[PDB]
Design a protein around this ligand. Structure first.
Ligand SMILES: [Cl-]
Lengths: 243, 240, 235, 231, 250, 244, 195, 241, 111
């Protein structure tokens, strides 16, 4: 054996064990989700409060790319930031040459090809993050999830991290109960509920909720963070459902 | 470009590639340097498992770096050509910019620096060569003899030997060389050098090379018969 | 094998730690700082009696106000000294002044970690850098291949270092004269050296504000050796 | 074990051992503390010597007039990273006539450390940093880890026995956060914090290192007789 | 990133063998049989078209390739390796010869260039040797007809007749009994078909056999007229029908 | 990374030997023997082809003996492909010298440079050395007729008579026995063939398993001629000395 | 710079080169030696652009001396001249070409013959019985066409050379402050002190 | 045994990394099939969407490389998309450089040459994919050309790829033994698609809904994929016969 | 053709006393016959009790002052907050200027 010691080496199965090992780092991370809605997307993430000494609201994890795309990830946080930095470079060069802001499927493949490239050589390490991202373009709303291998698909709902299975189950119920569609404001509330429900798998430390959204009607197609009254309203909705 | 760090430290603080390069020197044919009152003599062993040699054209063991400095060595022959070439080029470059030939110390310092560079550069192995560099500084009559080794350290010697069985000939020189009175003449210096090689060599036939360097670019290589006379004379005094 | 810039499980760089072992094999070098000057002394340690000891150069001038002693793989020090001299002279060119001793030392230490897969391995030599400037006066620095440097009132490096350092702990005080420091280096060198200390196998040097960096003659050191033997017998 | 030869290799449980070994170098380092109020931010650092003949290794470095950090671990790595911060702060001033936000300073350090954890040949940085600063959104304290993880805090501590000070600050949180417009009291709280990490040794005059930045105070460092006030 | 493999992947073992070259020759041994025979007025090169699937169109896969109008090549071993070698070989005939001298290289020199390319895959950083042996047949004014074998090491040898691959040992022995220095091209084609039948197991017809000659100039295959000195390619690939005609009088 | 798969071709053994050079020499010891003999009026080059097949084209073939310029030739022992890389470099080097100085290159200078290239592959670059040993036979107006040999280490030496490749130990003993300094070319031709005939691993030495060449001043007045022997000429010289 | 001459006779090559170095309206020096010894039996004189001349001469000198040490042998005058020509032929298509004209006087010890080569800054080489660079040739060539014989002695060559210097001192516009004369023969290179 | 980690020869002349890349091909557990009509080339592939949270419209292994060329992949999606982006770039460059649309077989050769390089160069791993290129070439007509991690490529009368490829292959072989021709003797592409689905059903022994399949069709001057309803329309036609 | 230089006019003046020094300059800034500003200062406090003015082409003048101010900042960083003496500043400014010898800063500088 030894097939797992070097990136880009096929095992006799046809697998790249180093990528599968990066997936373990993602499974270790905190829970993050994405909900696709009527005219947009909603992102939420669990922020473990390690200590009283953490300044609330001041360790922001959700990231904006361009002015219309939001990105959240679970796993090695620095690796996610590297991926977003590239995403911002990719989006800038697309807007430079083609004028129009980068479409979400186009943006998805840019990240996909870049992450896939880090499975081609033994001189680089695969990314230790699964990234949930999306936004609104000329063809409406899109939600994506990208994994260490470079694999990505479009999603109705997406979840990753330590509480992914709990969150996935909760997401599947929403898809079944709302075939016509979920509204942006509703999806924000649901995101809060799901993060609180997915927190059961990480319940030693209590946490801080962080939500963002892009909606054609509610945010005018731009990425914004949910703060103040709309955040507290979403927190209260979530608190009522766990009890 | 090939980048591998081949010379690295080991847990005990040794650089094995440098130390193994010293073993290549230990395998090489013996070379000796002795400096007199007014000269330096470089003696070199030539192994006799090679008959049918052509001595006219075969590379000589002692090389002129400039008209006033010479270089002999022990170790890998192919490696030594690279050091000699670089030294010869630096010799001409020094004359060009400083308008004065190199001092023996300077030429030695340059050669040693090259050797050192190959001990902490990626993709290269150290030189499997130790050198004896002898000569006279411009407009100076004080004899100079220096030694370098793969690590890059260099130093001055009243007399020194390198190569196989060098520890035996160093032993000889350590009791037979008086610091208070170095070989007063050319004859005395050549004899002490030939004597020291005869402790290790075999036959004093076509096994010993002797090169004499005197002040003001006066370098000459002795022929077989000339050396053979020293061999004949030493043996007759020995039977006593 | 393994990467040259690899960390051990204890959080140390293998190659840096191994180069420290090479330095322990080196010949002893001692430095003492006073308000009248800084003294630098080294053990020459000739491998054979035929080797002309005065060609052993382990104390070296960097500038008029900065001197340097070495211990370990001394061939590795050549490019360090070359850099130090260029740094010192370059600073004088750019700023029409002497460069601070600390700034010089920091510049030399910047070379240290420039290895990996830059040079192929760390340096196998430690340096004692002694000098004077107008701001911080007489200073002594110990520069390691880790890239770290400490200021010292007194410091020994090499094979006899831990024994000599313990001796320096007892002997050093803030009122030592230059002459007292000279004798103290000789005394402690004689203690840790293998062969018997004399003017041919040990070398002294100092840096003073007035006369700058000077390597002592074998005649001058011999008298200090004689003055030292007489004083120890005198009680 | 078999997966700690370099940073480019994941372990079967998804760990990067070279990064973890770099983290270990910080734990061996001398303790340093960081804390802030709404008006000032304070660094306190315990300096370490080789022996009684040596100087005490300086732990605090100034990055700009409004920013600086303290270090724990490999000091040369702190010099490289602080130099990078000095340049980034400087670029912001020359190009945009703008003081670099302490938050951006954190993001830049994170991304610099990260690149050293994904490529062959390189190594992680072997030092932890506590960055303090005062910018357009008031006082700040950051904690840098060479894994890339940067974290904004009211107070914290890194190094050997840092857990004592970190617990103390966690208790004192409500008190020291409201020490506004009083530098000497915020330092006193930081000096009392670092005292919870001492063993057999106490704070002396050439042992203690304090730094402060705030509303009407440039980033300045105190050593020697200037810290005698606080012992 | 970047190719960090700047070191040799083929090195000498204590016994003196070059492992990767030996192993490359082993890959050639596994390969399907190909052969070449030199006549007085031409050269023939032949091989079996091993089909991967009956749904595959074996006409789209050419084992015998034109390099210049007077030079052709066939192989045994790894197909993909051969394909890129043909690309490189065709280009080097232009860049290092035709663009300089205004004429096509003689067989021996083109062979020499291909051999160089294969030698470099034996010494350069981060590459394995080519897993093929080539047989190159060709004609040029001052050397006449010639036939060469190129091995993974980069070595090449001139042959009167030879075979490489699966059943090369038996095929070489067969050729030794039949070859004389008075063979006419048609006689050499006949012997090539006989020799190949021994190593072929399944169907033996013009669709499973690939065969080309180096013979007379073909003015009808030139594509233009008006230049007396240009008389057409000496390389010609025999059609499926042309092979079957000769298999009746076998 | 890629460190895992690096053979480290340019390192020392604990004994101070270069692994790859030693192993390349071991490879060369299985190659067909080549002999060079230097006479007072010329030089002989003789070499044994590696086990021949009857269907090999013998006349249009070159394996052992190559022409570097009009005054210098080489006999090869080792990988032919490796040798041709070096031969082309040597050919270009000779022309560079002629272009620069308007004089044919002195033999040693050409030998040194080719040997310096080999040396480089043993000290840097992480590549395998060239598995080749050369016998250089040539003439210049400084030293006249010269024989040299170089091997993968990049070390070269001059000879009166020398062998490379297989059975050098036995071949050298035989040459050392019958060689004398006042020897002529035609005598040297006979010695070369007699030595190969006794050291050969084959049953009997025939024309088709040999390459032969002479470098004489046997042109017309004060000029040197290179004669690469044709098959029939080797057949005749083999009969003339009574080997067949 | 300005005046450099060369005459090949039976047994030697004689080079004469002007001693003046003029910049602007000032003769800065009147004892300048516009020559370099490349090897024991090879001498090169030079004239042309300020700085370029000595820089090129010493560069060639360094290379020939390097060759001598490497091979323990002296290159023939023909070989040295070809090396020098090629260096100038390279130079002429460089970003900044050497503007230097040279004469190479040598004694071939293998042939026992004197040899004189004239090479201009373009790399135009010719072997000649007598040579000159610059405006000097416009007087000396015709003079030598008349008085030169191929079998002359070194003394006859010096008298023939005196005739050239006299003509130049009579008809040339500039004061070139006389010449330094050097002889190249079987015994090497020596300078005539009283000319 | 480091000869199994990089693309160098094993003692028996094999490249294990190439062989293991072939096994990565079946990691998706999807079977593909390609056939030729008179006027068209049809390619079909299974579509398995296990997760309910996936957007099914974004799950695809068929790619439109150019206006005329289509490509279906057997293997993981990251490598599949890597190959697709390169193929698109190569086909675009070819058109710019040479003034005409890149033929299907030429693109196949080019992608096969790239794959060959990864089998010879050490720093680059092979892509764990098999690429089936389809078109109606303006010179050669309906065309199917297929590439693998070894760098091998060849034209096909018809072909299949995936875990249960052998069953589909023989099924097609037996049809062409019977029909005695190189293609599907049918006028419309609609019925050639129907043939393709019919013979996949017979070989695999499974029934398909509209969301269990994925269809690409190449005609003169365009390659296009079918919607769920286009396939449903096609499934209804098969059922009513 | 584009001309990278311009002339912004104005004039400056420096006088030194026994324990003081003055550096004066008018506040007018011009191009051709137009006034750009009646108050645009070109005499600057650069720290360490050094005042500086680079008068001529203002873009080059500002660039130089900017670079020297930055040089003072890094001098502190690299040499333990040591005060940059006026003689050391002068030598440093020489190198700033000569570094652009073949594309000069078009200014008369006084400190
Ligand atoms: Cl291609």
């Amino acid at each position: 054996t030894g097939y797992d010691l070097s990136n880009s080496v096929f095992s006799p199965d046809g697998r790249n064990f180093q990528v599968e090992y990066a997936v373990k780092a993602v499974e270790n991370g905190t829970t993050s989700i994405g909900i696709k809605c009527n005219d947009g997307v909603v992102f939420a993430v669990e922020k473990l409060i390690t200590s009283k000494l953490l300044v609330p609201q001041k360790n922001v994890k959700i990231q904006v790319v361009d002015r219309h795309i939001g990105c959240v990830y679970s796993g090695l946080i620095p690796d996610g930031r590297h991926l977003v930095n590239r995403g911002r470079e990719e989006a800038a060069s697309f807007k430079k040459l083609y004028k129009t802001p980068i479409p979400i499927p186009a943006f998805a493949d840019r990240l996909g090809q870049y992450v896939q490239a880090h499975t081609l050589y033994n001189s680089v390490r695969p990314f230790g993050v699964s990234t949930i991202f999306g936004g609104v373009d000329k063809n409406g709303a899109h939600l994506y999830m990208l994994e260490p291998s470079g694999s990505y698909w479009g999603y109705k709902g997406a979840a990753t991290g330590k509480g992914r299975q709990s969150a996935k189950a909760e997401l599947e119920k929403l898809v079944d109960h709302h075939p016509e569609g979920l509204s942006a404001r509703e999806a924000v509330k649901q995101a809060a509920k799901i993060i609180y429900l997915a927190h059961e798998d990480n319940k030693e430390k209590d946490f801080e909720l962080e939500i963002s959204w892009c909606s054609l009607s509610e945010t005018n197609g731009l990425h914004k963070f949910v703060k103040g009254d709309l955040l507290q309203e979403a927190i209260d909705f979530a608190q009522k459902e766990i009890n | 470009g090939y980048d591998r760090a081949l010379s690295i430290f080991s847990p005990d603080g040794h650089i094995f590639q440098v130390e193994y390069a010293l073993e290549a020197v230990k395998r090489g044919t013996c070379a000796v340097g002795v400096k007199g009152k007014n000269c330096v003599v470089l003696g070199c062993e030539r192994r006799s498992t090679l008959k049918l040699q052509d001595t006219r054209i075969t590379p000589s063991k002692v090389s002129k770096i400039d008209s006033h400095v010479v270089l002999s060595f022990s170790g890998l022959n192919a490696d030594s050509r690279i050091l000699i070439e670089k030294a010869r080029v630096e010799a001409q470059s020094h004359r060009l910019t400083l308008e004065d030939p190199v001092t023996v110390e300077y030429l030695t310092r340059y050669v040693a620096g090259v050797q050192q560079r190959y001990t902490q550069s990626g993709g290269v192995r150290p030189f499997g060569v130790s050198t004896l560099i002898a000569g006279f500084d411009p407009r100076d009559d004080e004899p100079k003899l220096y030694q370098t080794e793969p690590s890059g350290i260099y130093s001055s010697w009243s007399a020194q030997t390198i190569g196989r069985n060098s520890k035996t000939v160093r032993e000889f020189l350590e009791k037979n060389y008086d610091r208070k009175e170095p070989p007063a003449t050319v004859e005395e210096c050549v004899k002490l050098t030939v004597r020291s090689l005869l402790e290790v060599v075999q036959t004093g036939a076509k096994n010993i090379e002797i090169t004499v360097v005197k002040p003001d670019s006066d370098i000459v290589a002795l022929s077989s018969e000339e050396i053979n006379q020293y061999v004949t004379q030493i043996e007759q005094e020995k039977q006593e | 094998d393994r990467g040259v810039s690899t960390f051990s499980p204890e959080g140390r760089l293998f190659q840096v730690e191994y180069s420290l072992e090479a330095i322990k094999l080196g010949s002893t070098a001692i430095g003492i700082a006073t308000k009248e000057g800084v003294v630098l002394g080294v053990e020459k340690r000739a491998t054979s009696p035929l080797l002309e000891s005065d060609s052993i150069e382990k104390i070296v001038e960097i500038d008029r106000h900065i001197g340097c002693a070495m211990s370990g793989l001394t061939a590795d020090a050549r490019s360090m000294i070359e850099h130090a001299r260029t740094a010192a002279v370059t600073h004088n060119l750019y700023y029409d002044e002497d460069i601070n001793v600390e700034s010089l030392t920091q510049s030399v230490c910047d070379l240290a970690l420039r290895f990996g897969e830059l040079m192929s391995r760390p340096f196998g030599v430690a340096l004692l850098i002694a000098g004077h400037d107008a701001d911080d006066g007489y200073q002594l620095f110990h520069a390691e291949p880790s890239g770290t440097f400490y200021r010292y009132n007194a410091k020994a490096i090499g094979s006899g270092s831990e024994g000599a350092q313990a001796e320096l702990l007892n002997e050093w005080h803030s009122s030592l004269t230059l002459k007292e420091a000279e004798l103290l280096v000789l005394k402690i060198l004689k203690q840790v050296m293998e062969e018997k200390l004399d003017e041919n196998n040990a070398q002294l040097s100092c840096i003073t504000k007035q006369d700058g960096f000077k390597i002592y003659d074998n005649e001058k050191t011999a008298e200090l050796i004689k003055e030292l033997k007489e004083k120890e017998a005198a009680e | 074990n078999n997966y700690d030869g370099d940073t480019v290799t994941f372990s079967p449980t998804g760990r990067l051992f070279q990064v973890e070994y770099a983290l270990e170098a910080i734990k061996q380092g001398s303790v340093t503390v960081g804390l802030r109020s709404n008006t000032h931010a304070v660094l306190v650092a315990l300096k370490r010597n080789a022996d009684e003949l040596s100087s005490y290794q300086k732990k605090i470095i100034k990055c700009d007039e409004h920013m600086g950090l303290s270090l724990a671990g490999l000091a040369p790595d702190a010099r490289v990273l602080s130099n990078y911060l000095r340049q980034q702060c400087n670029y912001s001033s020359l190009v945009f006539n703008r003081k670099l936000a302490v938050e951006r300073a954190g993001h830049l350090l994170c991304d610099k450390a990260q690149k050293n954890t994904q490529s062959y040949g390189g190594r992680p940085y072997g030092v932890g940093l506590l960055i303090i600063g005062y910018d357009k959104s008031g006082a700040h304290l950051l904690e840098f880890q060479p894994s890339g993880n940067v974290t904004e805090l009211y107070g914290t501590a890194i190094g050997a026995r840092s857990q004592g000070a970190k617990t103390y600050l966690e208790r004192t949180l409500d008190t020291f956060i409201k020490i506004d417009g009083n530098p000497d009291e915020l330092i006193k709280a930081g000096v009392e914090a670092i005292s919870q990490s001492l063993r057999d040794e106490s704070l002396t005059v050439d042992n203690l290192s304090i730094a402060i930045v705030g509303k009407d105070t440039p980033f300045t460092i105190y050593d020697g007789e200037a810290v005698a006030k606080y012992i | 990133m970047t190719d960090r493999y700047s070191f040799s992947l083929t090195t000498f073992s204590p016994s003196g063998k070059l492992g990767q070259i030996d192993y490359a020759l082993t890959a050639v041994k596994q390969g399907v049989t190909s052969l070449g025979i030199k006549a007085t007025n031409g050269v023939v090169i032949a091989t079996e078209k091993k089909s991967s699937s009956p749904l595959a169109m074996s006409e789209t896969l050419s084992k015998v390739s034109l390099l210049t109008p007077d030079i052709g090549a066939v192989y045994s071993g790894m197909g993909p390796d051969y394909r890129v070698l043909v690309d490189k070989s065709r280009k080097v005939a232009h860049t290092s010869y035709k663009r300089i001298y205004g004429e096509y290289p003689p067989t021996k020199l083109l062979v020499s260039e291909v051999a160089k390319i294969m030698q470099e895959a034996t010494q350069s950083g981060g590459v394995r040797p080519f897993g093929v042996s080539l047989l190159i047949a060709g004609h040029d004014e001052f050397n006449g007809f010639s036939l060469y074998q190129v091995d993974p090491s980069g070595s090449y040898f001139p042959w009167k007749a030879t075979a490489i691959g699966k059943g090369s040992v038996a095929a070489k022995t067969f050729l030794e009994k039949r070859w004389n220095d008075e063979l006419e091209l048609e006689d050499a084609i006949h012997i090539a078909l006989l020799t190949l039948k021994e190593s072929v197991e399944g169907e033996f017809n013009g669709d499973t056999i690939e065969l080309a000659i180096i013979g007379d100039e073909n003015p009808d295959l030139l594509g233009y007229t008006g230049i007396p000195t240009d008389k057409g390619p000496r390389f010609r690939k025999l059609t499926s029908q042309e092979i079957n005609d000769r298999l009746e009088a076998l | 990374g890629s460190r895992r798969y690096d053979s480290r071709t340019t390192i020392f053994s604990p004994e101070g030997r270069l692994y790859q050079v030693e192993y390349a020499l071991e490879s060369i010891s299985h190659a067909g023997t080549a002999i060079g003999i230097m006479a007072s009026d010329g030089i002989v080059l003789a070499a044994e082809r590696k086990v021949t097949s009857t269907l090999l084209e013998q006349d249009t073939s070159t394996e052992k003996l190559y022409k570097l310029n009009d005054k210098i030739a080489v006999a090869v022992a080792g990988l032919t492909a490796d040798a041709e890389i070096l031969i082309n470099t040597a050919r270009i080097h000779a022309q560079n010298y002629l272009k620069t100085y308007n004089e044919d290159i002195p033999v040693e200078i050409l030998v040194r440079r080719l040997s310096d290239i080999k040396q480089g592959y043993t000290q840097h670059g992480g590549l395998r050395p060239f598995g080749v040993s050369f016998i250089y036979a040539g003439y210049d107006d400084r030293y006249g007729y010269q024989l040299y040999t170089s091997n993968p280490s990049g070390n070269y030496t001059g000879w009166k008579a020398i062998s490379v490749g297989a059975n050098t130990s036995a071949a050298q003993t035989l040459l050392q026995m019958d060689y004398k300094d006042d020897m002529k070319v035609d005598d040297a031709i006979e010695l070369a063939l007699k030595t190969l005939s006794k050291t050969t691993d084959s049953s009997a030495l025939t024309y088709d398993r040999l390459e032969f060449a002479t470098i004489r001043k046997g042109a017309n007045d004060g000029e040197v001629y290179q004669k690469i022997f044709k098959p029939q000429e080797i057949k005749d010289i083999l009969v003339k000395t009574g080997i067949t | 710079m300005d005046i450099i001459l060369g005459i090949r006779v039976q047994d030697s090559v004689i080079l004469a080169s002007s001693k003046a170095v003029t910049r602007g309206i000032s003769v800065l020096k009147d004892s300048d030696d516009k020559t370099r010894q490349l090897s024991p039996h090879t001498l090169m004189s030079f004239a042309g652009e300020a700085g370029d001349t000595v820089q090129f001469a010493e560069y060639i000198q360094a290379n020939i001396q390097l060759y001598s040490i490497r091979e323990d042998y002296e290159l023939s005058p023909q070989a040295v001249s070809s090396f020098v020509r090629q260096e100038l032929a390279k130079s002429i298509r460089s970003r900044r070409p050497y503007q230097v004209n040279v004469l190479i006087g040598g004694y071939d010890k293998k042939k026992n013959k004197p040899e004189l080569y004239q090479i201009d800054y373009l790399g135009t080489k010719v072997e000649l019985p007598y040579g000159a660079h610059g405006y000097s040739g416009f007087y000396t060539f015709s003079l030598l066409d008349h008085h030169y014989r191929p079998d002359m002695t070194t003394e006859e060559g010096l008298d023939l050379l005196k005739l050239c210097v006299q003509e130049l001192e009579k008809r040339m516009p500039m004061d070139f402050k006389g010449v330094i004369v050097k002889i190249v023969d079987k015994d090497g290179i020596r300078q005539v002190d009283d000319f | 045994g480091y000869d199994r980690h990089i693309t160098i020869f094993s003692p028996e002349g094999r490249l294990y990394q190439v062989e293991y890349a072939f096994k990565a091909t079946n990691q998706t557990n999807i079977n593909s099939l390609a056939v030729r009509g008179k006027d068209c080339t049809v390619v079909i592939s299974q579509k398995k969407v296990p997760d309910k949270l996936l957007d099914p419209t974004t799950v695809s292994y068929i790619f439109c490389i150019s206006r005329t060329i289509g490509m279906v992949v057997n293997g993981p999606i990251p490598d599949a998309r890597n190959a697709a982006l390169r193929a698109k770039a190569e086909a675009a460059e070819f058109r710019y450089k040479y003034g005409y649309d890149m033929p299907c077989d030429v693109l196949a050769k080019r992608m096969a040459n790239l794959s060959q390089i990864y089998t010879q160069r050490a720093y680059m791993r092979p892509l764990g994919v098999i690429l089936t290129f389809v078109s109606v070439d303006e010179e050669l007509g309906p065309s199917i050309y297929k590439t693998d991690p070894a760098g091998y490529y060849v034209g096909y009368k018809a072909t299949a790829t995936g875990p249960k490829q052998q069953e589909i292959t023989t099924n097609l072989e037996n049809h062409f033994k019977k029909s005695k021709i190189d293609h599907i003797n049918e006028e419309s592409w609609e019925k050639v698609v129907e043939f393709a689905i019919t013979h996949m059903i017979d070989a695999l022994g499974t029934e398909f809904s509209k969301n269990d399949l994925e269809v690409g069709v190449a005609t003169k001057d365009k390659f296009f994929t079918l919607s769920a309803e286009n396939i449903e329309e096609r499934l209804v036609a098969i059922a009513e016969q | 053709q584009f001309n990278p230089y311009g002339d912004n006019g104005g004039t400056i003046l420096g006088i030194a006393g026994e324990d003081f020094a003055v550096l004066a300059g008018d506040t007018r800034n011009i191009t051709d016959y137009s006034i750009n500003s009646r108050y645009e200062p070109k005499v600057f406090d650069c720290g360490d009790n050094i005042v500086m003015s680079a008068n001529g082409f203002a873009a080059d003048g500002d660039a130089l002052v900017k670079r020297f101010k930055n040089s003072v900042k890094w001098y502190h960083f690299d040499h333990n907050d040591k005060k940059l003496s006026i003689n050391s500043a002068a030598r440093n400014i020489q190198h700033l200027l000569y570094g652009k010898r073949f594309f000069p800063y078009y200014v008369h500088t006084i400190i």
